[PDB]
Amino acid sequence: NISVDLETNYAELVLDVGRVTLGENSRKKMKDCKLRKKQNESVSRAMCALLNSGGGVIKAEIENEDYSYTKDGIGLDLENSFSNILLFVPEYLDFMQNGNYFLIFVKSWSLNTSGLRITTLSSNLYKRDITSAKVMNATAALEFLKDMKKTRGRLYLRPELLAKRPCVDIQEENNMKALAGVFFDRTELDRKEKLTFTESTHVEIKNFSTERLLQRIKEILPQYVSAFANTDGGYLFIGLNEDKEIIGFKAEMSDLDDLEREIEKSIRKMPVHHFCMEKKKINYSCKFLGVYDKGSLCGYVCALRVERFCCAVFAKEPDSWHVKDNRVMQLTRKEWIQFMVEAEPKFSSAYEEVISQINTSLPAPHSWPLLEWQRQRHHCPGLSGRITYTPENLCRKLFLQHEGLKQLICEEMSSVRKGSLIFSRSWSVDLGLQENHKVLCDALLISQDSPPVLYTFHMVQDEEFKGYSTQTALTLKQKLAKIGGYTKKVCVMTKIFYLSPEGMTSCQYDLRSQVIYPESYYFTRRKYLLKALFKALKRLKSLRDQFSFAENLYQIIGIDCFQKNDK
Amino acid sequence: NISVDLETNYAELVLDVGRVTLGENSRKKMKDCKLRKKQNESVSRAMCALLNSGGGVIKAEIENEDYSYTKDGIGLDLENSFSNILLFVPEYLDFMQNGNYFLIFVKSWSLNTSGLRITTLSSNLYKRDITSAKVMNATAALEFLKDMKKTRGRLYLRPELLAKRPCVDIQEENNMKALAGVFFDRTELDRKEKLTFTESTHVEIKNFSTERLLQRIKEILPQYVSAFANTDGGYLFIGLNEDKEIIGFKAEMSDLDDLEREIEKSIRKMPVHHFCMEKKKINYSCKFLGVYDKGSLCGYVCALRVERFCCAVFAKEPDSWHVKDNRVMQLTRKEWIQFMVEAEPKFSSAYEEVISQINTSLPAPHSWPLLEWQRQRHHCPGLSGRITYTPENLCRKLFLQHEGLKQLICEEMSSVRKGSLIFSRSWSVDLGLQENHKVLCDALLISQDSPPVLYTFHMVQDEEFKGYSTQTALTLKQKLAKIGGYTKKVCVMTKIFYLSPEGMTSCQYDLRSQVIYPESYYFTRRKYLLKALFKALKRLKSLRDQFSFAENLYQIIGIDCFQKNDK
Amino acid sequence: KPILAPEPLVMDNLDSIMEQLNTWNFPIFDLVENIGRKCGRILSQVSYRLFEDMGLFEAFKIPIREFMNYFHALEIGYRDIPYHNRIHATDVLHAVWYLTTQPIPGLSTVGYVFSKTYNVTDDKYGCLSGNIPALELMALYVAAAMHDYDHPGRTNAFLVATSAPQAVLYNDRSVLENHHAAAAWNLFMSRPEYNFLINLDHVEFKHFRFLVIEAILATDLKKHFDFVAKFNGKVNDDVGIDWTNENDRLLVCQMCIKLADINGPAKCKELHLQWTDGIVNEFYEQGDEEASLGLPISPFMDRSAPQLANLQESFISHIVGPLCNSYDSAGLMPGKWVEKIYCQITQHLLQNHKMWKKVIEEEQRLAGIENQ
Amino acid sequence: KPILAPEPLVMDNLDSIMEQLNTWNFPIFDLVENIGRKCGRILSQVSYRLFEDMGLFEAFKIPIREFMNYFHALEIGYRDIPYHNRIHATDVLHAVWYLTTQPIPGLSTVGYVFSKTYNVTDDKYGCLSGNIPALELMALYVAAAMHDYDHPGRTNAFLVATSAPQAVLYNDRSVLENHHAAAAWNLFMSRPEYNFLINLDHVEFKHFRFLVIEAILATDLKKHFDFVAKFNGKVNDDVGIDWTNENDRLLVCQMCIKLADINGPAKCKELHLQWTDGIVNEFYEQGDEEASLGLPISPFMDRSAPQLANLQESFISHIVGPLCNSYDSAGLMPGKWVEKIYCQITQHLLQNHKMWKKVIEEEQRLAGIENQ
Ligand SMILES: [C][C]N([C][C])C1=[C][C]=C(C2=N[N]C(=O)[C][C]2[C])[C]=C1N([O])=O
Ligand SMILES: [C][C]N([C][C])C1=[C][C]=C(C2=N[N]C(=O)[C][C]2[C])[C]=C1N([O])=O
Ligand SMILES: [Mg+2]
Ligand SMILES: [Mg+2]
Ligand SMILES: [Mg+2]
Ligand SMILES: [Mg+2]
Ligand SMILES: [Zn+2]
Ligand SMILES: [Zn+2]
């Protein structure tokens, strides 16, 4: 299937979708449609999962031998699936061939004007247009479900009265729904007679020149029961032809009871969801009519009647995915709609607003940012004031002891125009994770260019700590988007330093010269990463001392705490 | 073309789209594609215009002789066009055949979760997917334009630095954009040689085995200049084939001059729109390369280079319509963008909120509505307290004089379970219209069922006033949706009464038994029509005395006025 | 010298009537004449029971001698006027003890104190005293005892328009509610024998004094629709009442005391009728002083052309009506299941509203037949 | 008996110095010693010029005898303290006359009064006095004269924590700003010879008194980020400043006086340095009275361990910085075109901010070398 590749030195979720052919001309002349469909759906499930849980990278072994991607492209059946999930492809996907692999670097799905919170391969909520049943796309299923939730159900207008209208010969869609209502109650049908009505938003007609007809109803029926139930209800007549000449199918007795069992079987398997107090079921009724030619039974005709529902009705579960811990799963029907119906909190108190309102950055200086303040303005003796050592008390005690640490930190921040590193006794518990005690401390350098680095210091000559730092860089990358709201592309690099007494050297690991990324991942914004880092720490309830904004002045003027439900 | 039918007794905008064939089997076997396309586009322009300006009805003369609609349906090309403009068709369209005409009753487009304010047949803003140029749909062009407006332009990342990445043989999309960058500057092309690159999001390749090639470039080029300019820019090479074997076209000199003139002609005709300070132009550059076989010139190859833009670039004007006064027009490019970029005001002061939050109406009585109050609780001697004669001072003075008026108004409200009629010296000036002085007064009955009626009283035995009352009923139906926010279907009926001295009779006109509507237009909600009527009058600044909520109690408490920028 | 206390702290003549105190239609006017009305010590006596009932005399170690010393000094400050006197303060104290310590059908309970009786056996019957710590409720009970203290007898609009010294002092912004909280707190810190809050911290007494002031200021009616709009914005679209939040627990006590302040037309027809003659008897006094100055007499404040029914029908539909709808859509009104939910408080509001619509109908119809 | 006036109304010794009054760096401290500082009549003298300049003495028919009678009684109420005295009131009066009657590059003008000089010739140079009627500006000028009246010398946090009688009176909510507006308005209505607003209606004097109180209460710093957040929400996403709206014209005068109240670190380095020794000289006094009671001395209010530079660098980056960014992103700061736009006020803020960062660097670096 699709397994989380845990044998890679990327600080990201890597999915191994198996082997995949590639190229426009290679996918075209591929003489196996059932394979080419299964490969396309496997790269679409992976791309949907990574969009919903942070970001990641999809790794697919090239199947055809001589693939180049610089004279072969990707393919056309793949490009369509990419472009149906994402409005703008270049804002989310980057393609790169790395030797014997094809990699796709997926950004994280971010809240936009459309109001969607998660991506879906298919809602599987069908609707009924004038004559055809189609599937609700993402923005239709969002607006169909937000109304049902609002009115705690669905408002139908059961026949309290026939409207007193003038008397004039007029033809409407109730004329077809009326004629079919009497065709339904007909006890017998003459073979090769004429229909007084055609198909509309309340009537469907199926020919189905099939010998089995049961392996066909098994897969085409639940999308028509869903169409009718989701809009106004209707009828479905099986056993006609295209010329509106009633024929029926050559069905012997002892098979209609199986059919009625299969029909009632498939219809009781369809998922549903109620926004109302009671919990009804999909009301309906089947029926079989004879098509006696003149005195002999020529066949049969199955008439199905689906009444309008009160809430949603799925043809299958919502086809939306996500990766939970490993082994990417499918969003259950209770979680899927909870993304499509509910909002985010969005507190953003009045003090918090001006902490981020500085970030307008029109074409002008617009100085005085509040997320880059500090009382102590003297570290790194040979320098100007361009790095903010943030906690200012953990960054002081850590420098008193560990005599090699301070000179290593200053020798490291030499090549940075302007940044801010944020120490911590452990950056793993700050992100809601398990802590290991062999790690001395941590840091997080957020500079202008050179994407965020995560220094992991420690003084133990036994381990390597590649698993601690890499897993913490991964978790920090997903919270910066899924929680902090950062809407661009990020990668979190990593450095591991050994810090035995009497010496500050032996960089045990440097992840930057170990993994290659696309071009756009190496440039950040550094004012939206501080904003994003602020909100992620706040949502995790780990905001203690980063982002100083010292409150000796606030206390003189009685201004209150930053933000919480604690005063 | 499409003309506003001003010879109908409907209180609505009627468009006469001309003659139109109808039926599934009739449209299918129609042996004129250019006609069937022109008829479909004419019913789509009309349906888009009515969605944007209130509602209306489209009237189309049946072209085929024998048509039924109860055994012939509508079509399939028509049904698709309806379903592309509207998410849910049955919430907006009602179909009805009335003798020798086919009528479509269009609801008014209303603000929904999608955030769209107007409907569009085509944005004509193309974008570039991985290999193909496609058109931005409604929700893509909304999110593409709202970002450009937010940043006052478009943020590009011009090569301030090449990212310091590891040294590993890696293939990316810049490899194709780089190879094409050197194919572009090539001075000569060997005939039938290979390309080192394929087409991607920066490169397009066109065969164009055409004799003219100029009537073809005229209509396919501006959608590729728009694709590239709207995303990252790219190259376009004309004169190759599908096997990547450079061929060129057999073009003689002095035609490349005309071509370069036509290319620069069509590209300077494309519309644009800037959200930035400066107003640049579409930067680009054309070029022609020889395809000398070995020592002879075999043809030519046109290379086009489009650089990334700072703002939007249209292939044509936005294909969105609206009916201004009559003779439905097309929304200009400045009006179209102001709908897709800006919001509505939405003031809704604290007092105004509780006037509307009463309307939650859960499955419980939930009494005490504030839009149905009145001091005087005694009119219509034989009755209970179920009608609110709203102005309460215009309703009193009008009843003192006009001795026949009071008994007529009470004999008229006999058959109403619960409603509220709102008098006025003239309901035309209240809706921002021209007044005529021959009309004594007006009224507006808003009952539970029986959609809103507009009584027009007058005592002059010379006129008929069918044009005054009908035009005022029309303007009231559009303001209720476009301004009041009423999100269901409405028709405004009309009655005209003669009120000579000594007599209350002679109903000159009764529009209810003159026009037939669909079934759903005869049932209103009456709590959202008062809410809708409240906001329409407020936006028009005509809210004076309707909706009493007397302020003798408010003055004792000290509470202020209802709402305005007047205190 | 100062007002200290009556010699026997807790009297017992008024027994067998404090027992029927767990009922919404508490016969307040019968407990008045029961007590010697010459002096007036109802507020200190009704307060000792409701505090003994809840169990706050032990959870905070409140010395009873200093407690009764204060509340007796409190009631002497309440002037002798028709409506805003020491009886109205006891009715608003009882009404908040009821609303917070009675079974609410469908309330999810979570330092707390429950009522003495409460008959706690169900899981669908929660009470507000189990969703709010005892500190926030003792503040809400002390904020209700002193919320009309030293009332001049006039309304805010009168003090503002006539430029009274209390209006120039508080800048025409809650001229009365600022006065009740200031003049009552200023009397508390005056003497040392009033400090019944002696066994409290410094951070508690700061949070206590904050909640007491924020409740006495929510009983202003000029800010009525601001609260009712805010409360519906947190029960309609939000996640509901978040009983772990401290701003949400505050907004629920600011509505609980707002509703208890105006609770006249939600009691029996005999009780609601007595109060209504009280308030208009206060208005007519203001019309007297308002006509002896040259100012046009206010609406409803003319004892020669009274409109007692017009006033009460505008009040119930405009002010008290939409307030109980908000307090009921949030699922906080105490009622009882129907084997669907019965509400005694909302029923008196509906009955009393219809009672005044008859009086207005028969008064316009009758008046119309006379004047032709 | 009452303070009435000095005998010669408008003195003239202080001429040739009121002429250089249309400049942002008005030499206020030289006009002080110029006037006989034994008594102090600067506020009444600087007020008569700015009112004569605007032309409000005729647009409202303000009797000059009663005008000077009031403002002289006003300045005598301003206590004799280091910072919040009658000189600070003249600086905040002048700063609002400047901000509202000087050319703003790119302002779309629409009863109005423009400054006496104004040299009105351009169409890109609008002034705020042409977007706000004269009534809203005379309220904004009288609200600035009396906005620190009768200042006790302590801050709100001190009055609240020590339970001062002014804090129990106003319920710990804007204890000082409520006092300045009340004690100043109460002195106005005291005598009849102060009523210089005699030729006004009843509805004008009600709207005038409302705007005056709503401006004196916006100079509270505890509500700083509430205003700055509200002002950016109406210039960032809204339709801009809607000069036909009356709530938007109010919010622009509530920022204009907020910025003029804290305008020290936006003048020349000599002027800003004199004020800064003023304010900390006030803080040290509060630390004295705060240590003689047992309370821990507040930050920055310890005259033995002064941190004058730490305080001024936190103030400019936290309070005055983000306020001028908001008042500048809305395109209201008076400046000049560069043949792109020059801002004298914003430049002094940048220069002065860098001046204190040197003093902090050389004080930490030097201190670090001593303590190893
Ligand atoms: C001015 C006070 N007023 C508001 C309009 C008022 C009127 C009537 C009653 C009132 N009416 N009916 C009763 O039964 C007793 C009280 C609640 C109370 C108030 N009030 O705010 O206190
Ligand atoms: C408590 C008053 N305080 C706020 C922190 C304050 C400090 C400093 C100055 C100040 N600093 N520097 C100067 O040049 C003069 C004034 C504006 C003014 C105030 N204030 O609010 O009035
Ligand atoms: Mg009160
Ligand atoms: Mg009260
Ligand atoms: Mg002050
Ligand atoms: Mg000041
Ligand atoms: Zn249901
Ligand atoms: Zn541009």
Author numbering:
A (entry chain D), B (entry chain B): 2 to 568
C (entry chain A), D (entry chain C): 669 to 778, 800 to 1028, 1070 to 1102
Sentences from the paper on this structure:
PDE3A is a phosphodiesterase that catalyzes the hydrolysis of cyclic adenosine monophosphate (cAMP) or cyclic guanosine monophosphate (cGMP). A structurally diverse group of chemicals, including 17-β-estradiol (E2), anagrelide, nauclefine, and DNMDP, induces apoptosis by forming complexes with phosphodiesterase 3A (PDE3A) and Schlafen 12 protein (SLFN12). They do so by binding to the PDE3A enzymatic pocket that allows the compound-bound PDE3A to recruit and stabilize SLFN12, which in turn blocks protein translation, leading to apoptosis. The PDE3A-SLFN12 complexes exhibit a butterfly-like shape, forming a heterotetramer with these small molecules, which are packed in a shallow pocket in the catalytic domain of PDE3A.
In 2016, de Waal and their colleagues found that a synthetic chemical 6-(4-(diethylamino)-3-nitrophenyl)-5-methyl-4,5-dihydropyridazin-3(2H)-one, DNMDP, can induce cell death mediated by PDE3A and SLFN1217. One of the most interesting features of the PDE3A-SLFN12 complex-dependent apoptosis is that the pathway can be dose-dependently triggered by many structurally diverse compounds (e.g., anagrelide, DNMDP, and nauclefine) and cause cell death in HeLa cells. To elucidate the molecular basis of PDE3A-SLFN12 complex formation induced by the aforementioned compounds, we treated HeLa (SLFN12−/−) cells with their endogenous SLFN12 was knocked out that expressed Flag- and HA-tagged SLFN12 (K213R) variant with anagrelide, DNMDP, or nauclefine, and then purified the PDE3A-SLFN12 complexes using Flag-HA tandem antibody pull-down. To investigate the molecular basis of the PDE3A-SLFN12 complex triggered by those compounds, we subjected the purified protein complexes to single-particle cryo-EM analysis and determined the structures of the SLFN12-PDE3A complexes with anagrelide (3.4 Å resolution), DNMDP (3.2 Å) or nauclefine (3.2 Å). Garvie et al. also solved the structure of PDE3A/SLFN12 complex with DNMDP and reported the similar results recently. SLFN12’s helix is positioned at the mouth of the PDE3A enzymatic pocket, and the side chains of its L554, I557, and I558 residues comprise a highly hydrophobic moiety for interactions with the hydrophobic phenyl ring of anagrelide, together with the L910, I951, I968, F972, L1000, and F1004 residues of PDE3A. These hydrophobic interactions between these three molecules (anagrelide, DNMDP, and nauclefine) and SLFN12 “glue” the PDE3A and SLFN12 together.
